[PDB]
């Protein structure tokens, strides 16, 4: 039971100085959980979160800065996972699955 996968560019990882980079990662939303992997086969997940429960506090469309279809996954023990899809269409799609699983448990 997959929901969504695919490529995204995350700012969250990481911060140097002078702003930071946008690095590519691979993300999978399976069952209730969001897994984020370095790339399509690097099996150790740079981070995983239970959208349904305490570790996450929702999603917002991000303050579009340098990068066109940006949004973020709210995590209370304080990353916020910053993300940018390729197209507006692609972001609507993520945003809605991601925010769906938050309202679930």
């Amino acid at each position: 039971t997959i929901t969504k996968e695919g490529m995204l560019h995350y700012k969250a990882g990481t911060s140097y100085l002078g702003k930071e980079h946008w690095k590519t990662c691979f993300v999978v939303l399976s069952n209730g959980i969001l897994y984020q992997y370095p790339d399509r086969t690097d099996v150790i997940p740079l981070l995983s979160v239970n959208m349904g429960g305490e570790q996450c506090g929702g999603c917002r469309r991000a303050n579009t800065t340098d990068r066109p279809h940006a949004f973020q996954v709210i995590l209370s023990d304080r990353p916020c996972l910053e993300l940018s899809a390729e197209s507006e269409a692609e972001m609507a799609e993520w945003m809605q699955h991601l925010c769906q699983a938050v309202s679930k448990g």
Partner: protein, 308 residues
């Protein structure tokens, strides 16, 4: 005009509800709301809405509508409607522990906050359900949700804290009641705040003067006065109002007398936590924010008293 894609759009359908200053201020409302570093608090988001409605031309206020679907409390929807009530420009939806915001039907954010007013108690869930009040032009605590470990979620209707005001409007013509409370309630709040910080900072030797001198300072900075003394009794306080609209519940009254440790202990919080919101509904002041800035006066006057 360095505004966001959908910001520009939304603006362009709403830019003409707001005149002169209303215009620029509304814009930053929309800012804090949708395009700030972070997204609003459930309670702030609701302030922002009725900050806009205030700013809208009297004619365009029929566009600012609030309702519980199926008249069922558990959810309260806030929305902005186009001229021909054809489709929603802005939609805010507030459930039990989540809230979300739509613009042109784009999901802009969903947030999960933790709406337990009973946090000093880990055994106990307690939520406030709200529905729109016409007398105050804002949502109001309309139902209480209590989740014990012992009993299935008891609900407690509250329509009659509002009813106490329709009764006060249809008396002497209201503002009189609205005068006394704002000046009682916040005097109580500052007072509380002060004593409370002296109890935790027992060891620091905060004088009775500092305590007194700070109480008067916030009463000033807020512009509040203390008559009050001797508190005219033809006036029913919200604090009491709430206690009352909880007395006649064969559901709630009998509840209090189970896990009584926790007896009259847990009650004064529930009541208090309610009053604040009902008060905030009325004057749109966060009684707590005052209490803090009072608790703050006291510390920065004590800190100040090791200079002078």
């Amino acid at each position: 005009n360095t505004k966001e894609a959908w910001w520009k759009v939304l603006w362009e359908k709403i830019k003409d509800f707001f005149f002169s200053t209303g215009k620029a201020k509304a814009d930053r409302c929309l800012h804090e709301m949708l395009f700030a570093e972070r997204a609003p608090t459930r309670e702030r988001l609701t302030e922002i809405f009725f900050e806009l409605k205030e700013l809208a031309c009297a004619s365009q206020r029929d566009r600012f509508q609030v309702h519980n679907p199926h008249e069922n409390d558990a959810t309260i929807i806030l929305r902005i409607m186009d001229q021909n009530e054809e489709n929603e420009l802005l939609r805010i939806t507030q459930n039990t522990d989540t809230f979300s915001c739509e613009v042109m039907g784009n999901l802009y954010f969903l947030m999960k906050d933790r709406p337990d007013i009973l946090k000093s108690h880990p055994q106990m869930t307690a939520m406030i359900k709200r529905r729109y009040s016409e007398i105050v032009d804002y949502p109001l605590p309309s139902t209480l949700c209590l989740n014990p470990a012992g009993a299935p979620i008891l609900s407690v209707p509250l329509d009659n804290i509002e009813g106490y005001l329709y009764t006060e409007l249809r008396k002497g013509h209201l503002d009189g009641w609205k005068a006394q409370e704002k000046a009682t309630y916040l005097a109580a709040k500052i007072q509380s705040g002060i004593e409370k910080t002296t109890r935790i900072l027992h060891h620091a030797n905060i004088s009775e003067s500092t305590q007194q001198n700070a109480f008067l300072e916030t009463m000033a900075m807020c512009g509040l006065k203390q008559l009050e003394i001797p508190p005219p009794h033809t006036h029913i306080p919200i604090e009491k109002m709430v206690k009352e609209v909880l007395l006649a519940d064969k559901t709630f009254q009998a509840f209090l007398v189970t896990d009584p440790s926790t007896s009259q202990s847990m009650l004064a919080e529930i009541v208090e936590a309610i009053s604040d919101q009902v008060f905030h509904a009325i004057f749109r002041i966060d009684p707590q924010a005052i209490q803090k800035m009072a608790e703050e006066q006291l510390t920065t006057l004590h800190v100040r008293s090791e200079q002078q």
